[PDB]
Amino acid sequence: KRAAVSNKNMDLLGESADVIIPTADPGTHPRGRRPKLKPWQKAFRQGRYAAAVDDVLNTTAPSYDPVIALTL
Amino acid sequence: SAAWPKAEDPALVQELLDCVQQASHYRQLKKGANETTKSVNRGTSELVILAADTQPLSIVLHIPLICEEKNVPYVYVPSKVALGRACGVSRAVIAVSLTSNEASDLNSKIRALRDKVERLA
Amino acid sequence: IISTFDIRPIIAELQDIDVAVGGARGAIYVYSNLLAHLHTLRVGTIQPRKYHWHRRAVHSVKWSGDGNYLISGGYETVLVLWQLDTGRVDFLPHLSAAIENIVVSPKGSAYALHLDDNSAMVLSTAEMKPSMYVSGIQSLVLGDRPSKDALVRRVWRPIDEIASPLVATISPQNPSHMFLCVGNGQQATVGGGATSTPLVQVFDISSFQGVAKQAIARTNPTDVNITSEGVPIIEPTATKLAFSHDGKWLASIDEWQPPERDTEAYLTGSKTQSDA
Amino acid sequence: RRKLRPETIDIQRTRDIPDTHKAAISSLAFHPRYPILLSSSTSSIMYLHKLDASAYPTPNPLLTSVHVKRTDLRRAAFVGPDGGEIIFAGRRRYFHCWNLSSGLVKKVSKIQGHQKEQRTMERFRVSPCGRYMALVASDKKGGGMLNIINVGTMQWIAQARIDGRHGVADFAWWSDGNGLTIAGRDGQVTEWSMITRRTVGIWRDEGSIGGTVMALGGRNGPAELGGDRWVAIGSNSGILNVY
Amino acid sequence: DTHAVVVAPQRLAEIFNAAPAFAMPPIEDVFYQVASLFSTKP
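^ inputs. structure came back:
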């Protein structure tokens, strides 16, 4: 894939420009990768605790960590 | 009327037009009444599409006889000038007919298309 | 029970009205064609539409703007925009406390939110960043209107009560600034019976405005206010708190425990629930 | 300005707009009262120039050069008979209103229970009455829809749905504002009212395979279709009809 | 409001080169033909 303009040249352009409109929220991620959600968290937060606890407590899973378990 | 394998089904018609357009880019498609009839008599053809709304319909009524004889499917669209600028020539083709080759995805599309026409029958 | 209501007119005359009631049951009924339902012994059937979101008490339902949208503000810290032409509901979910009062601007462009913890922010509609903010001292209040949610004998009953001095201090090296412990809001804090003030605001004495806010204990503002049994969730509360001599350090201390109505199965011998 | 004769036209080339962009120009519009040109190019750049040939030391000065971060600017537009607002939208899932009066720049980001339908706000057109705005739902599937959003409060208030085979090519606001004409690919033309907010009528461009652009104008056309007169439809194949 | 007409010069030439000058139908007839072509009336 090839861009029209990459963000870097867009940034040079904004430096050249006069008034710069900051679209980014003042005080979240500038590149805009946010902290994304993990499934057990999403379940806990909505309120399906059975599924939340189980997805943590599968011990066969490669991401299995007791410290997650203790936090949940 | 006489246009008894009428195809008014909209997604069907759109697939037919697009297949014609692709075939026009593949040079495997003959534009016009006279040439359609030549192609079917020489047998090379594999499908033929006509237009219902010609004013004397009789100038295309001769095609279904031959194609019933030499056994190739035919089907009517409702709009001649649509067919024409589907070919891409700017003048309302009344009869287009598109033929076979050896190895082409376009040949496959033709086979599925004539299956759809035989469904419509 | 009618917790509140808001009218909307149907028009140099007034041709009909449609008036919306909101109830502490957790419901929002709307009435549609009132003037001709009632102007004409016998009258036809009437039936409110029922729009049900909250579990707690809706504090304030207002007709919107056009009259296309029905906005709502509740205990559960979340301002709902009922779509009312479809079935849908699109909503601003995370406020710092109970939405206590809203009003719709002259044009449809601004909302005013009296946030139950004694503040106010003006929004523009559909941009939802608060263009305006004014907060208050955020403390614990003997409130005059008793409640909106205490009408229907909830499991933990709300009592306007005070059980502790409001933990606070003044700052050396900045005497205009006072630190004081606070909860999500007043009502959510005093709810659950116990004090739940895991938060600090810093407030100015000279100009009695808000200055800032921060957390101390674990806070989940991002979360359901209510455990599924139907109870406000208590959140850890800092008993003592004092300031450093230079103005550079701040020591809080928090205590928390489970609820006696949770424990309930840890009873072994003479074990009681307060003990546990 | 003399009224114009039907085979030739006294066209005069003028001074170029001086500052060029850094990619292909994507949207133009003029301010509806003062001759001031909004250009807007993919390089995230909006230019306001004053139209002046005889200006000095540079003709057609640039009033301002406003950059927008992180987005492109596919379509900009003037809003309001008064030309109150400037509304611009790139590919990215939000868009912006710019109030020239007081110069505030509100960033609008939410479409009230269609937010999953619209993963882009690329195309849009504003009513000449300047109250409504129409966004297109990037969800093709047998038929495309365009949402109607009050610029009174930037709220969702309507969603016209037309049949197609790919969705909506283009559309235009009728000159009164009351309805809007939706030219969807495979040449369907819906005319969809606003006051009734249900489709008035359906008809067909005369057999064009894929409609790409339409637009609409003229005076003393039939009032119950809004009172616009000529309507132009442009195919993919290149043939362009006028009705 | 009305404007200047637009005609196909092939049409005008067709009108006249239809027939030779002698035994051409008379001038009032051909004038009605031509003005009817140039008529500004839908």
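Chains A and E do not touch (no CB pair under 8 Å). Residues 5 and 11 of chain A are 10 Å apart (CA to CA).
thumbs up if we can close this ticket
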